[PDB]
C-alpha cells in the first residue's frame, strides 16, 4: 500500500515528463539535468580532487570514519550527470555509511564511448589503493548506468589482478545494454520515469552490447565481493536486477537482493521528499557497515 509521498512524486513526475518518443538533444536533457539537482545537505563537506584525470570530490558527511572510502559511479545512462548532479544523494549515503566518498566525473558517452568509463572507474579504484585505502576498508556503489559500471569495475580490476573491495551495491542497476528483459514490458505503465536505447548506442558506438564490461549480466561474477543490489518494484530495470542476482548466486557471490514495493528507478535521490528514500540510503549504508565490521 503506497505512501502518500510516492503517490504525490509520481504524479509530479508524470506531470513534467517529456511526451514519449519526444526528441530532447544531449545538451538539453544534460543542462535539464543539473538544473533540477537536489543542493547537498549544509553539514556535507567537500573537497575537489583529481584522480586518474578526472574531477571528483571527497564527499564527506558528518560522522565519517577514517580509512573508510566508498568510490561512487554516478548515473546519467553513460551520457549525462555529474558530481552536481548526485552530490546530494552521495552526501546521505556518507552519513549513513559513516564513510567519505570519492564522486567520479568519469568520462561520458558520446564523447567518450565505452569503455571509457569502465577505464575511468578501475583507474579510480587503482588510485584509491595507491593512496593507501585497505581493500577491506573500501567499497563501491553506484545508480542507475552507475550501477552497471560498479559491476563492470568489479569485473575489469578483478581480471586485472586488483583485490575486491569489502562491499558492492549497485541501486536500480542497468547492466544489460540490450534492454529486452520482459519489464520493459510488464513495469512500463507503472514506471513515470525508447530514450534509453539512444542512450545504449552512444555508449556503445558499434561494440558488442553483450560485452561483459558494457552489460555486466552477462559477466562472470565468481570473486566478487557481497552485492547489495536496490531496485524498485515499479520500474523498468527490475529485471536487471532480479537477473543480476540470480547470475551472482550461480556465481558464488553473496547477494542481497531487496525489492522495494511501489519504489521508482533510483527512488534514493528523492530522499528529501520520499520516505522511502531516505529508508533505503539508511539500509545502503548499514549494510556497507556490516560488510566492513565481517
Request: charged content about 20%.
Amino acid at each position: 500500500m503506497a505512501g502518500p509521498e510516492i503517490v504525490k512524486l509520481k504524479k509530479i513526475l508524470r506531470e513534467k515528463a517529456v511526451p514519449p518518443g519526444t526528441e530532447v538533444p544531449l545538451d538539453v536533457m544534460r543542462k535539464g539535468m543539473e538544473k533540477v539537482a537536489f543542493k547537498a545537505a549544509d553539514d556535507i563537506q567537500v573537497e575537489q580532487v583529481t584522480v586518474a584525470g578526472c574531477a571528483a570530490e571527497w564527499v564527506r558527511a558528518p560522522g565519517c570514519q577514517a580509512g573508510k572510502a566508498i568510490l561512487y559511479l554516478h548515473g546519467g545512462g553513460y551520457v549525462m550527470g555529474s558530481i552536481n548532479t548526485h552530490r546530494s544523494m552521495v552526501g546521505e549515503i556518507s552519513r549513513a555509511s559513516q564513510a567519505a566518498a570519492l564522486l567520479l566525473d568519469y568520462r561520458l558517452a558520446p564523447e567518450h564511448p565505452f569503455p571509457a568509463a569502465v577505464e575511468d572507474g578501475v583507474a579510480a579504484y587503482r588510485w584509491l589503493l595507491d593512496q593507501g585505502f585497505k581493500p577491506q576498508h573500501l567499497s563501491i556503489s553506484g545508480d542507475s548506468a552507475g550501477g552497471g559500471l560498479v559491476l563492470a569495475v568489479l569485473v575489469s580490476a578483478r581480471d586485472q589482478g586488483l583485490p575486491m573491495p569489502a562491499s558492492a551495491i549497485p541501486i536500480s542497476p542497468w547492466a544489460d545494454m540490450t534492454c529486452t528483459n520482459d519489464s520493459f514490458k510488464t513495469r512500463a505503465e507503472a514506471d513515470p520515469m525508447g530514450g534509453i536505447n539512444k542512450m545504449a548506442a552512444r555508449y556503445l558506438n558499434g561494440a558488442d552490447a553483450k560485452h561483459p564490461y558494457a552489460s555486466p549480466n552477462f559477466a562472470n561474477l565468481k570473486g566478487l565481493p557481497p552485492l547489495l543490489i536496490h531496485v524498485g518494484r515499479d520500474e523498468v530495470l527490475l529485471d536487471d536486477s532480479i537477473k543480476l542476482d540470480a547470475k551472482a548466486k550461480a556465481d558464488g557471490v553473496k547477494s542481497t537482493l531487496e525489492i522495494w514495493d511501489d519504489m521508482i528507478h533510483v527512488w534514493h535521490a528523492f530522499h528529501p521528499m520520499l520516505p522511502e528514500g531516505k529508508q533505503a540510503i539508511v539500509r545502503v549504508g548499514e549494510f556497507m557497515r556490516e560488510q566492513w565490521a565481517a
